Amino acid sequence: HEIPRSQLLKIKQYEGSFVEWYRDLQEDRKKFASLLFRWAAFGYAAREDDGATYISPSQALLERRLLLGDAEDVAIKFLDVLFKGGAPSSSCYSLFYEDSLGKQLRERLGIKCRRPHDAGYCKILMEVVARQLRSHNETYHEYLNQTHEMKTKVANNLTNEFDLVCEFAEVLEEKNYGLGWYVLWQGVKQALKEQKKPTKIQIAVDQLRQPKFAGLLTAKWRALKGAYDTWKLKKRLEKRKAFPYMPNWDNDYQIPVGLTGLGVFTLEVKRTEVVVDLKEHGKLFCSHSHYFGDLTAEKHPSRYHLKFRHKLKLRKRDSRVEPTIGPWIEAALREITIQKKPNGVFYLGLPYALSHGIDNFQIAKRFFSAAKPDKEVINGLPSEMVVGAADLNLSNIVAPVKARIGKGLEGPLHALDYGYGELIDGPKILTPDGPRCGELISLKRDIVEIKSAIKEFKACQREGLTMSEETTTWLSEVESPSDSPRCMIQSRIADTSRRLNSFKYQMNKEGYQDLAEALRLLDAMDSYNSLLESYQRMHLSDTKRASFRDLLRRRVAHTIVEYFDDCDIVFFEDLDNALVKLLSPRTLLLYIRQALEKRGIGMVEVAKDGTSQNNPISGHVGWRNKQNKSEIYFYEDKELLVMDADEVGAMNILCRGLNHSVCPYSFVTYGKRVKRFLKDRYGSSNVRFLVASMGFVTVTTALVGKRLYYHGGELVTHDLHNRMKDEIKYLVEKEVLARRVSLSDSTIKSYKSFAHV
RNA sequence: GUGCUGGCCGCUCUCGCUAGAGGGAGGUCAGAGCACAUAAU
Ligand SMILES: [Mg+2]
């Protein structure tokens, strides 16, 4: 229970023979990574033609046999034990030091380094080599796995709709339009009704009239989107290069040195500078950073003890904000890293490991993530916890819930195999959206509409047609130096740019106070990128935007962890939503996990199916109000109820977390969760299902491949689910008076959603 | 210590011109509070 972290200090001065040491290490690394990589049969794409060609692993094997000759097997074992790593690889730096697998191949190939007489030099050299090769092997395997899975996804999805949409795409490319989901959807929609005046889309609807496209018009809204997704996925699959790039080798790599026999370095912190004193290669003077504020270090037999605390960098001299100092941080240091960035400045890195209680992480690992917690875990659970849940959305960024649970305690809630609980802080919204979230949607809408206008401009002028009155009227509202159909596109690009730039300045002056207000600016900027990118292709028929996204993810992860500081576990829905695709589906969860892990708090990911449609109290199905997304409607006991969508989602996430997500929402006619559900709710798991009454399902110890839904303690068929959602819909269409039900009320006897016991 | 900000000013490239709009280096003047696990992709 030591969490790894790192940060950098800038190196001001140097003494002794330091630069010679660094240059020799980097040159030997560059020379020998090449040889030890081409020892590995790795496929790669040539960088000299943007990956147009490549080298197959069979060609790589032939070249390897050409180079090594009679020493293939020994190098195979050496490189295998290098990639595996660990203690066996910790005493095998013999590849360069003149004084065990790497020892004998030197006598067979005669490889030597710049300083074969310096044990530390060779130690760091092979450490850098092994780290650089390991950073690439993992990426290579995950790349091949992803390409295979992404191909097999297309190989399993074939239908007449897919081929017909492929033909439609080829026809559109011949007409120079390019196929998108919006055009496909709206053209299918408008093909059914004959047109009167020219429309924002005309070529597509005109070309959809012919009988060859009769298959599209008779297809189901579910199959059409599936065919479109398959077509786009196949396009990317045929655009992606075969193999990963072989790593760039002229660039410099970070050099690790520590106290464990790799070398000698002593850290002593004084009033003005930090000093690192290598015994023979000189000493380095480093300035103080606000990250390691009030830094103190003390020697220990095989470690260092750092005692620092974060501060605020007020680079402004006449700062107007009161300086604040974060809490003390007790960290352990084992190694340091030295590197030269391309700008020409050295940096010193301090990888420090934190100490925290392992109990919370063990609790969130084996108990709340398993349907079978073995008996020693229950006997090892405490008698008290505070838990929380969060629902992440573009609007109402975080909707948190706090609850207190414990064995031997009574409350409305229920925790599987543990006991009951009650709410501490009622379901609510952590922070309402700022005033500028509304104005940062119109901009993105304008950008995307401009993209579509350019897309139809290409085809219309290729065909010698006349632009529809809608686009011409839409682009005429903005001042332009002329009236041509091409001038009024850039005369609108020049307005979107100014609006986005004014937002960028004004929100940066404040340090990006609101969060859901900056997540909208990120969408606006992402859409503007693709507007400009498509702009410079009309004939051909940055890291400052990927850093704002990183900052926004870190701010979101900090906003979450600040609220649940006193909690022990937090529940999040398994996001493999308009916000998860904006930041990332894989890194936003990683950043949230890191932020919570910083404070010794666990995190548990629960199934996301149906957590926004059930009734938390009664467990019945509800119909989400399409007109107003923030309200969800139910129908219990001849009365219609209304509830807050975000609070319903948070409570359902909490209920699924407290139930380990073992109660399903839908299943075909299984897995561990549904097996345990059938074992507990009903007699056994290996049981057939038979329909009875009118939409109800009786479990008899028939139907196959059907939707069976859990609602109120009984399974229903797909038709009866649609009937219920219809019942409710109709009830709200005749204005029936609903009731307002609050989840934080203390008069609730129980919560039954996702509760099968 | 690292990251994220526009305004203006010449130069230099890519498409169009009933017309300009975007890209890359550099100069200069203002802004500047709140996050950090670093390397790569
Ligand atoms: Mg939700």
Residue numbers in the entry: 4 to 102, 174 to 615, 627 to 661, 671 to 763, 778 to 809, 815 to 870
How is this structure described in the published paper?
Cas12h1 is a compact CRISPR-associated nuclease from functionally diverse type V CRISPR-Cas effectors and recognizes a purine-rich protospacer adjacent motif (PAM) distinct from that of other type V Cas effectors. Secondly, as a member of subtype V-H, Cas12h1 is distinguished by its relatively small size (870 amino acids), functioning as a compact DNA endonuclease guided by a single crRNA with proficient DNA cleavage capability, highlighting its potential as an efficient genome editing tool. Cas12h1 preferentially nicks the nontarget strand (NTS) of target dsDNA and indiscriminately cleaves ssDNA by collateral cleavage in the RuvC domain. Displaying a “Crab Claw” shape, Cas12h1 contains a distinguishable recognition (REC) lobe and a nuclease (NUC) lobe, with the two lobes connected by the WED domain.
We further reconstituted the wild-type Cas12h1-crRNA binary complex (hereafter termed the surveillance complex) to identify the activity of Cas12h1. Most residues of the PI domain (residues 103-173) are invisible in the surveillance complex, indicating its structural flexibility. The surveillance structure revealed that the first 1-5 nucleotides of the crRNA were the pre-ordered seed sequences. Although the lid motif (659–678 aa) is flexible in the surveillance state, structural superimposition of the motif suggested that the lid motif in the surveillance state clashes with the NTS in interference state at dT(13*), indicating that the lid motif sterically blocks the substrate from the catalytic site before target recognition. Specifically, the flexible lid motif is kept in an “off” conformation through hydrogen bonds between L660-E658, D659-V700, N671-L466, and L676-R634.
